[PDB]
Amino acid sequence: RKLGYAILGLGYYATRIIMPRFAECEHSRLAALVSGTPEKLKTYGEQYGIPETHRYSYETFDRIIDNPDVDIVYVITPNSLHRPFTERAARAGKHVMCEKPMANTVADCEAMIAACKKAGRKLMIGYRSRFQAHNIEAIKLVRDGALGPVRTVVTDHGFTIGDPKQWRLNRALAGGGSLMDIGIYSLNAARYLTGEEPVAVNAVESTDRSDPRFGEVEDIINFQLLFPSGATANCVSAYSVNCNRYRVSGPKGWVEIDPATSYQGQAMRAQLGGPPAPREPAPQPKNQFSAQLDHLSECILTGREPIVGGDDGLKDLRVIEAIYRAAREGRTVKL
Amino acid sequence: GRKLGYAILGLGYYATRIIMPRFAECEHSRLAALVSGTPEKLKTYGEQYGIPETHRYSYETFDRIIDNPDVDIVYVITPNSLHRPFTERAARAGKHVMCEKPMANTVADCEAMIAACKKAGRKLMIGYRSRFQAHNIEAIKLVRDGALGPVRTVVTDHGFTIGDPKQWRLNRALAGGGSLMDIGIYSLNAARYLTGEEPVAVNAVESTDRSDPRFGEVEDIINFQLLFPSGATANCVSAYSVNCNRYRVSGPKGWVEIDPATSYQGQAMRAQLGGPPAPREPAPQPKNQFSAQLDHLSECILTGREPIVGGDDGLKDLRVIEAIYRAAREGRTVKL
Ligand SMILES: NC(=O)C1=CN([C@@H]2O[C@H](COP(=O)(O)OP(=O)(O)OC[C@H]3O[C@@H](n4cnc5c(N)ncnc54)[C@H](OP(=O)(O)O)[C@@H]3O)[C@@H](O)[C@H]2O)C=CC1
Numbered sequence: 001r002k003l004g005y006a007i008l009g010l011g012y013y014a015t016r017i018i019m020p021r022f023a024e025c026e027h028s029r030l031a032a033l034v035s036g037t038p039e040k041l042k043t044y045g046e047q048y049g050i051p052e053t054h055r056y057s058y059e060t061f062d063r064i065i066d067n068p069d070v071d072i073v074y075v076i077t078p079n080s081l082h083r084p085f086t087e088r089a090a091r092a093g094k095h096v097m098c099e100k101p102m103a104n105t106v107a108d109c110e111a112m113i114a115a116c117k118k119a120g121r122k123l124m125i126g127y128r129s130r131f132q133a134h135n136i137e138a139i140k141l142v143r144d145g146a147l148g149p150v151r152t153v154v155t156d157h158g159f160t161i162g163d164p165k166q167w168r169l170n171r172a173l174a175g176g177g178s179l180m181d182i183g184i185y186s187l188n189a190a191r192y193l194t195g196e197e198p199v200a201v202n203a204v205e206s207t208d209r210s211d212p213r214f215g216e217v218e219d220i221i222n223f224q225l226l227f228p229s230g231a232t233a234n235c236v237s238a239y240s241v242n243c244n245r246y247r248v249s250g251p252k253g254w255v256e257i258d259p260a261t262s263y264q265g266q267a268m269r270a271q272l273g274g275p276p277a278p279r280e281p282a283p284q285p286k287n288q289f290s291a292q293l294d295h296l297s298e299c300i301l302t303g304r305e306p307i308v309g310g311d312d313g314l315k316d317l318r319v320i321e322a323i324y325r326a327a328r329e330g331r332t333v334k335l
Numbered sequence: 336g337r338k339l340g341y342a343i344l345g346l347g348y349y350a351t352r353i354i355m356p357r358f359a360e361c362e363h364s365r366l367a368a369l370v371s372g373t374p375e376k377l378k379t380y381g382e383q384y385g386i387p388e389t390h391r392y393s394y395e396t397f398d399r400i401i402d403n404p405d406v407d408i409v410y411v412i413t414p415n416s417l418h419r420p421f422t423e424r425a426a427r428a429g430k431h432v433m434c435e436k437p438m439a440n441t442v443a444d445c446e447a448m449i450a451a452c453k454k455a456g457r458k459l460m461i462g463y464r465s466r467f468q469a470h471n472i473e474a475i476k477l478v479r480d481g482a483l484g485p486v487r488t489v490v491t492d493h494g495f496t497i498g499d500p501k502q503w504r505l506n507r508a509l510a511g512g513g514s515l516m517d518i519g520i521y522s523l524n525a526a527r528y529l530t531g532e533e534p535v536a537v538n539a540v541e542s543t544d545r546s547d548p549r550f551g552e553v554e555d556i557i558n559f560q561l562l563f564p565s566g567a568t569a570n571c572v573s574a575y576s577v578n579c580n581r582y583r584v585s586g587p588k589g590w591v592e593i594d595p596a597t598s599y600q601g602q603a604m605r606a607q608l609g610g611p612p613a614p615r616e617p618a619p620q621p622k623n624q625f626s627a628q629l630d631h632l633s634e635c636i637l638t639g640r641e642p643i644v645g646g647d648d649g650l651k652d653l654r655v656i657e658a659i660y661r662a663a664r665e666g667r668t669v670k671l
Pocket residue numbers: 008009010011012013014034035036037040076077078079081099100101126128167173181
């Protein structure tokens with residue numbers, strides 16, 4: 001039994017990463033395409049055997065309500081378009097998978113959650129790392145007490161962004177700079193490794209406004225989190241260096257992954273009793289992308305809630321607003 | 336090769352286990368005298384290292400060292416609150432001074448030490464041995480040569496799981512503070528020598544369980560953020576409840592990291608420059624970091640040059656440390 005996905009926004013992530021991974025799914029299938037580029041509907045429609053009756057533009061998208069082969073709409077557009085396409089998908093009676101970051105603001109996330117609730121449809125955010133073997137192993141080591149109580153999480157995410165004209169460097173479409181796009185991985189990991197929500201936030205921003213890339217959004221914004229248990233996080237978010245890693249540490253030892261949240265190539269190292277050494281995670285039956293897709297399908301089929309629902313996305317946006325505020329006001333912001 | 340004579344003062348762990356055995360590889364330095372509050376230590380190490388009784392001093396007879404021309408330098412290796420009084424007395428006795436980190440408990444103390452050595456016309460150096468360590472020298476060189484491009488981030492963590500609750504490091508009066516004074520200072524010092532800059536803004540967060548037998552008086556964790564004039568940033572960890580020793584410095588062209596970074600031995604460097612991350616071996620150094628540190632002061636004295644890690648370097652760390660404690664206390668960005 002497989003639920004049908006409509007993929008909306010046929011860009012790099014949709015076409016290079018997500019659509020090929022339906023091949024390993026057990027409860028999900030590609031059923032429809034939604035695009036603002038007629039040429040893409042033809043190319044990918046022909047490639048994946050999607051009939052013309054199942055190809056939509058953004059103008060005809062609302063007609064998808066009459067297509068019973070579509071159960072889920074997966075929104076993979078620029079960030080500022082997540083809310084209106086999610087709302088339209090909910091009004092078309094479809095369940096929704098929405099890419100991170102959920103939306104530009106807390107208020108926008110709340111609107112999305114309300115729309116899906118009103119429709120009685122499920123909502124999930126594309127935090128694929130929660131289905132990735134090494135990440136699952138790090139969470140397990142923490143929960144099983146192998147580190148003792150978490151004391152520090154040190155995590156850095158960044159890449160050297162290029163073309164100044166791309167939507168990520170356009171405030172109207174991206175909603176912000178590095179923190180919205182890649183810094184969110186540091187924040188999301190701080191939260192799922194501690195299993196807590198932060199109560200205090202520091203931040204420092206640093207952007208060269210003479211750089212042609214950074215006229216509108218931020219380059220570096222680094223932040224500190226304090227959690228109720230006393231756990232702490234030091235996080236890097238950057239558009240001008242390459243990094244992808246975290247280490248979580250307690251009095252009994254530590255575990256790190258570098259790269260941590262990449263598409264592939266994860267490598268884990270741990271210091272648990274003895275000297276630092278590589279550590280293999282427990283095997284997972286499916287890659288992180290197929291696992292994410294099937295998780296939503298399986299939740300709908302069994303009447304359960306996604307482990308990374310709209311509330312997880314909303315909680316990230318709450319802290320993101322606090323981080324921007326702490327950097328603007330130069331003070332510790334309380335949550 | 337002329338060798339200047341060292342008087343080692345405060346015969347504790349670092350003095351006896353780490354420093355004194357490393358005079359063997361020195362080329363311009365020799366062990367000439369001992370200063371201790373424990374008579375047994377003066378006998379044991381006096382006999383082991385062939386130091387005549389005429390060159391053994393207590394804290395009571397230390398000032399007499401002014402009359403001993405075999406002693407050029409006094410190396411102060413006591414608890415932190417005693418760095419200033421012994422530095423002052425050494426300067427008064429006409430000796431140059433090597434002083435362990437942290438320089439002293441406060442900025443005011445550091446300034447007084449600098450003034451006292453200035454008045455005596457003698458040189459002052461702080462024991463930042465990492466500046467003489469092969470992998471650290473290599474990271475600095477990569478930055479200075481432009482291999483990374485402009486420095487954008489420094490991420491550095493220093494900590495160890497401290498044990499005995501009764502030791503002087505957990506006593507506020509003797510240590511001046513908790514993890515930041517002892518081990519977090521390596522994160523700070525590295526952020527400064529990797530960027531080559533001084534911070535203009537500081538954030539910090541403290542996390543300490545005061546009901547822990549170890550942490551009634553001093554802090555466990557205090558993490559901090561630094562902003563530099565170039566736009567460079569640093570994220571730093573200081574801890575007494577986890578083990579970490581590392582840094583990565585990154586720019587648009589690539590990055591280099593060392594883990595462990597500032598340990599006695601065992602350093603390993605990895606870099607992402609012309610390709611994917613791979614091991615990198617640093618340029619070899621003639622002597623180990625300890626012997627190199629000892630010889631640096633001696634050579635400075637012999638040639639009339641200033642130490643690369645003089646009193647001003649220790650003072651600049653204490654200025655930022657004061658700002659870090661303030662930032663954590665007040666919950667705000669502190670401007671420097
Ligand atoms: N979870 C992960 O690991 C990743 C998540 N993402 C997320 O996926 C989303 C898309 O990122 P990515 O796929 O890299 O971006 P791309 O620019 O590669 O694709 C964006 C697509 O969105 C559609 N779109 C609709 N309106 C616009 C517009 N005004 N300007 C540009 N594109 C528009 C287009 O599809 P059409 O031509 O079909 O209309 C376009 O190709 C973002 O939210 C990003 O955060 C991205 C990469 C990895």
